[PDB]
Amino acid sequence: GVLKIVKVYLAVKRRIQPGDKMAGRHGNKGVISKINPIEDMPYDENGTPV
């Protein structure tokens, strides 16, 4: 019933958005919900944010 086929592949690049599921190896799973201006993050006396 069919005598020619075409296959097409499509590539998608995905960043991180609120609601994505994240996990640490020690069973510590959680969903992320925020993206902050880097200024807001707590930072050390050496000026490095987390």
Add this chain to the structure above:
Amino acid sequence: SVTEFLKPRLVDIEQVSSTHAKVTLEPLERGFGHTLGNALRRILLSSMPGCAVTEVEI
């Protein structure tokens, strides 16, 4: 735009009491609100010039 930032067209004067008026600003560039709020907050409690009452001889 490369060196221009949005500025607020501010309207709120709500003096629920004359001693405190509720004010509001909008719009501000992303994140400036914390910067401005913290700066003015620190100014208002610490920096204001004023007269104070401190003495009792009795």
